[PDB]
Design a protein around this ligand. Sequence first.
Ligand SMILES: Cc1cn([C@H]2C[C@H](O)[C@@H](COP(=O)(O)OP(=O)(O)OP(=O)(O)O)O2)c(=O)[nH]c1=O
Ligand SMILES: Cc1cn([C@H]2C[C@H](O)[C@@H](COP(=O)(O)OP(=O)(O)OP(=O)(O)O)O2)c(=O)[nH]c1=O
Ligand SMILES: Cc1cn([C@H]2C[C@H](O)[C@@H](COP(=O)(O)OP(=O)(O)OP(=O)(O)O)O2)c(=O)[nH]c1=O
Ligand SMILES: Cc1cn([C@H]2C[C@H](O)[C@@H](COP(=O)(O)OP(=O)(O)OP(=O)(O)O)O2)c(=O)[nH]c1=O
Ligand SMILES: [Mg+2]
Ligand SMILES: [Mg+2]
Lengths: 622, 603
Amino acid sequence: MKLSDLISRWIDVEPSKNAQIILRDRYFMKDLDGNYLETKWEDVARRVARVVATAELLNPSYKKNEKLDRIKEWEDIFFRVLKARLFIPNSPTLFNAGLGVKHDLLWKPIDQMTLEDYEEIYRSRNHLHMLSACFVVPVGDSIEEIFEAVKEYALITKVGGGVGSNFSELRPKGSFVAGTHGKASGPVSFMHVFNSAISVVKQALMGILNINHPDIEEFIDAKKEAVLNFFNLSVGFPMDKKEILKLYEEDGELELSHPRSTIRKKVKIRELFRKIATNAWKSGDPGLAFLGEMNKYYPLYPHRKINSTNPCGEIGLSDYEACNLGSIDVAKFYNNGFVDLEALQELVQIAVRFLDNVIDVNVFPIDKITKAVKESRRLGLGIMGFADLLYKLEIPYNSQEARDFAANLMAFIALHAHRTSYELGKEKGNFPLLEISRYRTEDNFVPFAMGMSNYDDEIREVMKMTKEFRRNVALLTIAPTGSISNIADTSSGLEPNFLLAYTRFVTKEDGTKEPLLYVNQVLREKLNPEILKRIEKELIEKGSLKDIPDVPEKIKKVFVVALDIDPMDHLLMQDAFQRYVDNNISKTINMPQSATVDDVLNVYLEALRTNVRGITVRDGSL
Amino acid sequence: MKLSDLISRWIDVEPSKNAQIILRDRYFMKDLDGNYLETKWEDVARRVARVVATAELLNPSYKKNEKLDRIKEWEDIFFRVLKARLFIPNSPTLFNAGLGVKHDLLWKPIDQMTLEDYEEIYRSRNHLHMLSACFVVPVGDSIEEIFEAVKEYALITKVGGGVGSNFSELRPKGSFVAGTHGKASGPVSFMHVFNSAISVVKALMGILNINHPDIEEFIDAKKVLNFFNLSVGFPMDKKEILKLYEEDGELELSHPRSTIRKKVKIRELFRKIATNAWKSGDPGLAFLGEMNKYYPLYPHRKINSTNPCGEIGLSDYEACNLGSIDVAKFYNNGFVDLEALQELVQIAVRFLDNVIDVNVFPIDKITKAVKESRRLGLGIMGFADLLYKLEIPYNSQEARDFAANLMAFIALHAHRTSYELGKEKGNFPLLEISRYRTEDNFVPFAMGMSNYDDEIREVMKMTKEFRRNVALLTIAPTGSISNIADTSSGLEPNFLLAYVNQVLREKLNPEILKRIEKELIEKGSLKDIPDVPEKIKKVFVVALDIDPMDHLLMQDAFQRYVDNNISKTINMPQSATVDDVLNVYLEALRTNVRGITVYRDGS
Ligand SMILES: Cc1cn([C@H]2C[C@H](O)[C@@H](COP(=O)(O)OP(=O)(O)OP(=O)(O)O)O2)c(=O)[nH]c1=O
Ligand SMILES: Cc1cn([C@H]2C[C@H](O)[C@@H](COP(=O)(O)OP(=O)(O)OP(=O)(O)O)O2)c(=O)[nH]c1=O
Ligand SMILES: Cc1cn([C@H]2C[C@H](O)[C@@H](COP(=O)(O)OP(=O)(O)OP(=O)(O)O)O2)c(=O)[nH]c1=O
Ligand SMILES: Cc1cn([C@H]2C[C@H](O)[C@@H](COP(=O)(O)OP(=O)(O)OP(=O)(O)O)O2)c(=O)[nH]c1=O
Ligand SMILES: [Mg+2]
Ligand SMILES: [Mg+2]
């Protein structure tokens, strides 16, 4: 099916009442007075499409005699895909597109648009026109660098970004400070300042400490009993995952040390791991960040180095680098028992361009970030709706079938994303740092592990072609998609549905407040409406269909939720996707309440054997 | 008595055992390995004197063929007064003089010193060579400016400065922020960030004006601002505010970047301040309008905050270095030796003004605001022990008349020295646009309690032409430096005679001393000890023998002849009431004080 046809099937389907609340709540633009400028998703799509299409002003392949034609064509395709809700960029794009721009230009009919109208939009983008979700800043070992970074956290947060740092540069607690004949506080104590800062710019953050830092144990325990309430915390592994797994298997020891300290200590790695697993088993923190694995696949490594992820972990970033995201709802690409690969390829094409255009209309609060992004042009195209896609295809999430499907789907998207990046480098110019990247200086560099798809050889072929032309350093991620999957009425990221049914309460102004039942749409349409009526009550009490009487087996096996899927099946699904993502992946390893700390440990060990770049894990713990 | 004679009398008097501990703990310089480079007070005086003398390198009145002998003469007079402990600069000067400089140059004998040795000292001052106690930075109404200011607090704190801000520029809690769907957190929430920053580098001053919509929240703030001293700012004239109170008027709380407006009864605001001050000692009162009344550079420049202790009101990014003369050492046969004193005032101003030229700050804007103004804070310590020696009770009109004359005299000669230094070295950059220039009978304090007034006016007129410094005077708390100098703190009464006071040892037999010693350490006074001569009781008063108004009136007598402000605690008995506090405030608004601190015993 052509994309245009699929667009027609969805373009007049309106967001559900649930989505509309979220849109009214945070997305619809308002004036200084608090009046709505936007009252319909369509108005958001109009504005966003117009602003991002405006980047086509910069397109060197266009003749002035042609420019307004082209810009208008991109505006309409971007508009049509956003309105149909087939692709949605990360929230900051939808919040901030067109801030600074006269309200007369953002929503007026495209037929009325002039070249000078598009140029005025370009011109009038204010310092709040920040369209990217993901940021990393360094935090260097000095009072001056720490507080410059606290300021940067504040500035980035103001404009709607999420920021992470590796704090390992900071000398351990108790170490010698020259200026003071005193003693250093250490990273964990400086992270409270970043926490206090942000908790006031918000009337989540990423903090990483490397496994060999002398304060690592303190770090691991930092969120137990949480002073760092705005931080997600991951333990950083800058060495190879193989070395770490080997050291564990031999019951080896790790030396904790720091260059600007005389503080040295030997710890049993098994013991470090158990402490991390015990804390993660209790509270969910800290996760694991396989920084070495990220650098394995970083085209610019070792010239440039990935030290931290953004707050949700899906983008590994070098210092001052940012990254903009967007997601395709692949549940909408289901057609009679197959995924419509024809319409999907056309959309991957459009999406890569939309995302790459976001960089040109993006305004960042810090010059070093502007420069880092211009230089690399890193994107994060991903998917949402994948669980609902498996439901439609009648595939159990917790099956080798699902993971095989997932790796092929991702491999196909990867293929056509990187092909589009090739085409864009040819059309608009390569990312400045192409020449010094492994796409150039190597033969056979691929930014992911592959090994689970028929498309591998074709992918290799595209990667070789991008030695010449390449618009972007990296193109892909799977994000959490909390809100944008809500807007799109679909399941989040690559995550299974957490629940098939819950009560979402609607506030009658006025009246009082209504108990409104949600049942998963795909469940509603496959399950016999009279079975639904019966079990509906038990499903809400129990959270699964598995021990409900008189629901056919095939419905129980297909309509699995997060907690029906055991930890390894979660882990292996992450692996399947990561093999064909050049950035990282947002995946919660959900674990049953009855899981032990050893069960967590075993996930970590398995994690070290698979291709995952990071780990997040237990029901009932928080 | 010549100053050289008075120097001879104290120069070989050794710091006490108490003082020596303090010196060893934090003043004696140490190397990277923790070994002492200095083992006695004289080593400190040597180093500090040499470094500050180095500023005479910059003196355009000296030929090069003269500079060496000149510098050496200054090093020597500086060394002698410091060693004698007759004048001691603020602590940062003691801690930080000579940082960055080869250890063979700092204690080497003065006769071996060459012009190149001095030039090397000058050149090798490092980024930590910060010698000033008092700082103010703005905190403007944007995320950018707030977090730059948090950065500045950290940087200033690192090098040993104390910093204050007026937070009033920050739009009130709940106000509209363009950037977001969120509302503004308010000055007070933001003050917690400053407090967190400092809690990791470590004391601070936070002011919020009386007409800020968040003022009541500010007043209640310390009822996790553990590092803040808090003062309510009064940018309006003290007259208007006292008038409004007396008329039971209302104040309009508003902010330019908020729609949040509210009316409160000023009397109710004051009662709420007094209630909290009554409980915990905070917040104090900062009469900003009154500081600006005597600010030579107002209104082109403006004083919005003080340093953490209140004694210097500072414009944005301005800093100020302090030094104190121990006036107890100037007692001679029933009189203050004004002859030696005038010589020291002369030397002290030069020392303090030289400190600017060898000072290094961590923020260019501070460097610039200090070069432009050259504000000094010359004060006194030892005052209370002076009153002991002179047999004057602190809580008497005699004491306050004494204090005003003494302060008047010091003012006279400091400002006369400022004029001389302007002629010698060049005027402060901003003289032309100051009220010393653009006005006729501008005087930077109220006066009205000394026969030196006409002479003071005459010197102020002279400083239309030549003037090295925008302002010269303060009374600081002098906690540590008065400990070093074995004397009483600032203008404060002694808090306690025994925990024994040396002037009390030298005056009471003993026998009566041996006997009463423990009763005086329980009761904390001589007041209700019988068999102590009435003359001894009257003179040897402590902080809490002196009622609140006598404290306040002593502050007023000094402030009349101080161009900056004054650090003074209004001590109150434990049985004082919230109405007793309010009465102190109302009296404060009628006197010439520029700020208020109260402390009720037992709080
Ligand atoms: C000054 C100071 C630094 N530090 C920490 C902050 C950084 O993690 C680290 C270095 O701070 P810096 O600001 O770099 O200290 P410095 O340059 O004076 O000393 P050094 O030559 O040893 O760098 O020490 C504290 O924890 N507390 C302090 O009071
Ligand atoms: C005001 C407000 C904003 N948001 C916004 C802030 C974020 O920009 C947005 C997240 O929406 P998504 O774009 O779905 O972000 P994500 O969950 O995919 O994660 P990533 O940050 O890695 O892209 O949610 C809330 O969740 N709740 C709120 O109350
Ligand atoms: C952004 C933001 C600002 N503020 C406060 C900080 C300052 O007191 C004040 C100004 O912040 P600003 O950073 O100036 O916000 P803006 O300039 O983009 O928009 P506006 O001019 O309308 O503010 O708002 C918050 O309290 N929380 C916030 O998240
Ligand atoms: C009284 C007293 C002061 N101090 C310290 C705190 C400071 O580090 C040190 C400063 O030297 P000071 O002589 O205290 O400076 P000051 O008190 O005049 O205050 P400022 O100049 O800021 O207006 O005094 C103690 O450590 N213990 C004490 O008992
Ligand atoms: Mg350093
Ligand atoms: Mg602003």
